Design an enzyme around this catalytic site. Structure first.
Site, PDB file in Angstrom:
ATOM      1  N   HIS A  59      23.489   1.301  -1.894  1.00 21.53           N
ATOM      2  CA  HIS A  59      22.369   0.934  -1.041  1.00 21.53           C
ATOM      3  C   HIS A  59      21.199   0.299  -1.777  1.00 21.53           C
ATOM      4  O   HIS A  59      20.146   0.069  -1.195  1.00 21.53           O
ATOM      5  CB  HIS A  59      21.909   2.080  -0.150  1.00 21.53           C
ATOM      6  CG  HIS A  59      21.954   3.406  -0.816  1.00 21.53           C
ATOM      7  ND1 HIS A  59      23.021   4.272  -0.706  1.00 21.53           N
ATOM      8  CD2 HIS A  59      21.059   4.009  -1.620  1.00 21.53           C
ATOM      9  CE1 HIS A  59      22.769   5.359  -1.410  1.00 21.53           C
ATOM     10  NE2 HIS A  59      21.579   5.229  -1.967  1.00 21.53           N
ATOM     11  N   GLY A  69      12.617   6.862  -5.875  1.00 24.63           N
ATOM     12  CA  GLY A  69      13.025   6.226  -7.115  1.00 24.63           C
ATOM     13  C   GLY A  69      14.007   7.025  -7.922  1.00 24.63           C
ATOM     14  O   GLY A  69      14.500   6.559  -8.947  1.00 24.63           O
ATOM     15  N   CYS A 112      17.160   7.997  -6.997  1.00 23.86           N
ATOM     16  CA  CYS A 112      18.582   7.625  -6.782  1.00 23.86           C
ATOM     17  C   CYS A 112      19.165   7.007  -8.028  1.00 23.86           C
ATOM     18  O   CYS A 112      18.525   6.295  -8.776  1.00 23.86           O
ATOM     19  CB  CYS A 112      18.640   6.644  -5.643  1.00 23.86           C
ATOM     20  SG  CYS A 112      18.366   7.464  -4.048  1.00 23.86           S
TER      21      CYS A 112
HETATM   22  C1  I1W Z   1      16.631   6.976  -3.461  1.00 25.04           C
HETATM   23  O1  I1W Z   1      15.828   6.912  -4.614  1.00 25.04           O
HETATM   24  C2  I1W Z   1      16.665   5.579  -2.795  1.00 25.04           C
HETATM   25  N1  I1W Z   1      15.608   4.929  -2.451  1.00 25.04           N
HETATM   26  C3  I1W Z   1      15.917   3.714  -1.857  1.00 25.04           C
HETATM   27  C4  I1W Z   1      14.971   2.748  -1.364  1.00 25.04           C
HETATM   28  C5  I1W Z   1      15.448   1.545  -0.781  1.00 25.04           C
HETATM   29  C6  I1W Z   1      16.850   1.294  -0.681  1.00 25.04           C
HETATM   30  C7  I1W Z   1      17.799   2.233  -1.159  1.00 25.04           C
HETATM   31  C8  I1W Z   1      17.317   3.441  -1.754  1.00 25.04           C
HETATM   32  S1  I1W Z   1      18.212   4.796  -2.436  1.00 25.04           S
HETATM   33  C9  I1W Z   1      16.056   7.970  -2.420  1.00 25.04           C
HETATM   34  C10 I1W Z   1      15.858   9.405  -2.912  1.00 25.04           C
HETATM   35  C11 I1W Z   1      15.080  10.300  -1.982  1.00 25.04           C
HETATM   36  C12 I1W Z   1      13.563  10.080  -1.937  1.00 25.04           C
HETATM   37  C13 I1W Z   1      12.993  11.444  -1.578  1.00 25.04           C
HETATM   38  N2  I1W Z   1      14.028  12.351  -2.046  1.00 25.04           N
HETATM   39  C14 I1W Z   1      15.205  11.770  -2.301  1.00 25.04           C
HETATM   40  O2  I1W Z   1      16.198  12.351  -2.716  1.00 25.04           O
HETATM   41  N3  I1W Z   1      16.929   8.022  -1.258  1.00 25.04           N
HETATM   42  C15 I1W Z   1      16.725   7.450  -0.053  1.00 25.04           C
HETATM   43  O3  I1W Z   1      15.664   6.854   0.159  1.00 25.04           O
HETATM   44  C16 I1W Z   1      17.767   7.558   1.055  1.00 25.04           C
HETATM   45  C17 I1W Z   1      18.305   6.151   1.422  1.00 25.04           C
HETATM   46  C18 I1W Z   1      17.910   5.872   2.848  1.00 25.04           C
HETATM   47  C19 I1W Z   1      17.152   7.076   3.374  1.00 25.04           C
HETATM   48  N4  I1W Z   1      17.108   8.061   2.276  1.00 25.04           N
HETATM   49  C20 I1W Z   1      16.537   9.302   2.309  1.00 25.04           C
HETATM   50  O4  I1W Z   1      16.703  10.132   1.385  1.00 25.04           O
HETATM   51  C21 I1W Z   1      15.645   9.668   3.508  1.00 25.04           C
HETATM   52  N5  I1W Z   1      16.413  10.740   4.152  1.00 25.04           N
HETATM   53  C22 I1W Z   1      17.146  10.502   5.311  1.00 25.04           C
HETATM   54  O5  I1W Z   1      17.063   9.416   5.944  1.00 25.04           O
HETATM   55  N6  I1W Z   1      17.948  11.552   5.663  1.00 25.04           N
HETATM   56  C23 I1W Z   1      18.895  11.666   6.831  1.00 25.04           C
HETATM   57  C24 I1W Z   1      19.603  13.011   6.664  1.00 25.04           C
HETATM   58  C25 I1W Z   1      18.114  11.621   8.151  1.00 25.04           C
HETATM   59  C26 I1W Z   1      19.969  10.554   6.816  1.00 25.04           C
HETATM   60  C27 I1W Z   1      14.113  10.007   3.202  1.00 25.04           C
HETATM   61  C28 I1W Z   1      13.887  11.299   2.417  1.00 25.04           C
HETATM   62  C29 I1W Z   1      13.375  10.109   4.541  1.00 25.04           C
HETATM   63  C30 I1W Z   1      13.486   8.841   2.423  1.00 25.04           C
HETATM   64  C31 I1W Z   1      19.394   5.991   2.504  1.00 25.04           C
HETATM   65  C32 I1W Z   1      20.270   7.147   3.004  1.00 25.04           C
HETATM   66  C33 I1W Z   1      20.139   4.667   2.424  1.00 25.04           C
END
Ligand code: I1W
Ligand code: I1W
Lengths: 306, 306
Positions: B41, B143, B145
């Site tokens: 992603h 950040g 991921c």
């Molecule tokens: C990663 O670091 C990522 N950030 C980005 C930003 C732009 C594009 C792709 C990615 S991967 C981040 C880690 C998070 C931040 C807070 N705690 C973490 O572990 N993960 C994500 O941003 C994922 C990405 C988008 C949503 N997401 C989330 O973690 C959402 N959670 C969410 O939507 N959860 C559901 C169970 C409802 C699906 C939040 C915490 C709201 C940002 C992907 C799944 C593609």
């Protein structure tokens, strides 16, 4: 989100660990530039532990009596000197992995990471705190002496502890990198006791802030209080007095959550008097005091290092 | 003596972290040999999160759209392919620090260390466990991921987790290094829920053993029991059933302490029914389940690594 007992990345330190042997005694040493630091009792035998005369013991040693191994590589000891409770062995080779470092003597309440080593080889890493009674609640077995404690400031490694011994209570004591013990302990097998320990109040508050940052707000209240009234309660529970310096230090977290430090002190006061009632904060049933206000910021903001 | 939440030394992994950027999105990647692994992603924009079609999204990308930095060094992407939920970016340079490694898909109950990274740079390290519901209770911010989970077996690094997301409950989910999610989760912003979590019974027993090894014996008794009677009680408290395999696994610790596994099960049974009564085990007021029988042996015996 989330909150863990986070240690610093150990890479920069792992490159500095070595094995020091003198006779039948083997322990770890810290190799920085052309010097290897290690506890001075590496020259003692079981017969010298009770009341060793280190000057004498060292005078009867020559550079060839010290075997220093860095992996499969052997380092030639070209000189030696004793500084307080540590031995400085000069070697013919400068460590090419030597990072940017400095030595620091920390104060009780401060936290650091420990790289537990055995035979010059890293077994594991964990975070701990220097308790008000100058001991640490570590995890060390035979052969662990030499293992160091450190903190990382941007690109610099700050060494602050070298391990030496274990007390009957199962806690530990060591020195700074200049050989000075933390606390009233000596490196000889005589009766020694760690003083009464207390809780690091300021760290407990930082942890409650971390709790709010992470969504746990059940312990909050509308009450408030004064530093004076708080400290009166605190002493009754063996908590360290709280000072204006501590209040100023918790500033950033107070600002981030909108809960005033003196307000948080009221929450804590109530927690001490009425307990937690089968409830938990950040997954714990006890008030944690091994997270400094800076540790909290670092983990809830995402500070990285070289 | 002593017992801590010990993480593995991170040195071997720190050398493999990089920064991957695609447009405005930046996250971490794992560089092993001439390949960089990262969550797929990284090619998505905020507009594609809801229901992304990864094949399409990737078909519209060319190797120059991927900026990979290893420190001040930029790596040239000479190819790309998607494997399940991860992206494999082929680079023009093999990582000279690549350690001896392997990829493994762990099972719930197993523990591993996490190297939390931000912008290709290691922020910290901590130990955690894969919960029965396929999530982990981590500490991750924006950040994060790309950050990986690993275990060290002698001289080999075993990668077993790559971080992808956070659930509403503040817990986390990710994949193995082959892009397969642990649990029923997908990498898109649709309603997802982690299942009911339970306590890892076998780990709790290992921890009670650690307690005995460290002198805490107040919870022991003369009673005993059968696997059958125990599991009946366990289910009532949301504990994972205990099997003969688990009993055999706890063997070394049973032998070391002289307390039979079925005897320890009786102690636990009583702890569940009557609680701890304001008392603690290894400095805790709750029964800990993030220490595997092997973790205990490793810490109470002193196992090291290259
Ligand atoms: C990663 O670091 C990522 N950030 C980005 C930003 C732009 C594009 C792709 C990615 S991967 C981040 C880690 C998070 C931040 C807070 N705690 C973490 O572990 N993960 C994500 O941003 C994922 C990405 C988008 C949503 N997401 C989330 O973690 C959402 N959670 C969410 O939507 N959860 C559901 C169970 C409802 C699906 C939040 C915490 C709201 C940002 C992907 C799944 C593609
Ligand atoms: C170090 O690894 C060392 N081992 C040796 C062996 C021979 C010579 C020198 C050294 S330094 C080890 C670490 C210990 C092991 C268990 N947990 C630890 O932290 N430290 C020691 O062996 C010190 C050495 C000798 C005694 N000692 C101890 O830690 C004693 N404790 C002790 O005598 N405590 C008093 C408070 C009564 C002084 C035990 C745990 C009994 C081995 C020195 C102080 C020189």
């Amino acid at each position: 989100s989330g909150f863990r007992k986070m240690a610093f990345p150990s890479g920069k330190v792992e490159g500095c660990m070595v094995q020091v042997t003198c006779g039948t005694t083997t322990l770890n040493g810290l190799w920085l530039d052309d010097v290897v630091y290690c506890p001075r009792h590496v020259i003692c035998t079981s017969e010298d532990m009770l009341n060793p005369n280190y000057e004498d013991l060292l005078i009867r040693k020559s550079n060839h009596n010290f075997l220093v191994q860095a992996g499969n590589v052997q380092l030639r000891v070209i000189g030696h000197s004793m500084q307080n409770c540590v031995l400085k062995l000069k070697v013919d080779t400068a460590n090419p992995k030597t990072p940017k470092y400095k030595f620091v003597r920390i104060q009780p309440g401060q936290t650091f990471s420990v790289l537990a080593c055995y035979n010059g080889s890293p077994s594991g890493v964990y975070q701990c705190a220097m308790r008000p009674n100058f001991t640490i609640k570590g995890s060390f077995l035979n052969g662990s002496c030499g293992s160091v404690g450190f903190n990382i400031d941007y690109d610099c490694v700050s060494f602050c502890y070298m391990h030496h011994m274990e007390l009957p209570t199962g806690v530990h004591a060591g020195t700074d990198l200049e050989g000075n013990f933390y606390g009233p302990f000596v490196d000889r097998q005589t009766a020694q006791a760690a003083g009464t320990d207390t809780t690091i109040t300021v760290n407990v508050l930082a942890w409650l802030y971390a709790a709010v940052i992470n969504g746990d707000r059940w312990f909050l209240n509308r009450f408030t209080t004064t530093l004076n009234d708080f400290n009166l309660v605190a002493m009754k529970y063996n908590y360290e007095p709280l000072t204006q310096d501590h209040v100023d230090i918790l500033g950033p977290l107070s600002a981030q959550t909108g809960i005033a430090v003196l307000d948080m002190c009221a929450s804590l006061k109530e927690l001490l008097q009425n307990g937690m009632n089968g409830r938990t904060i950040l997954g714990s049933a006890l008030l944690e005091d091994e997270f400094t206000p800076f540790d909290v910021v670092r983990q809830c903001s995402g500070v990285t290092f070289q």
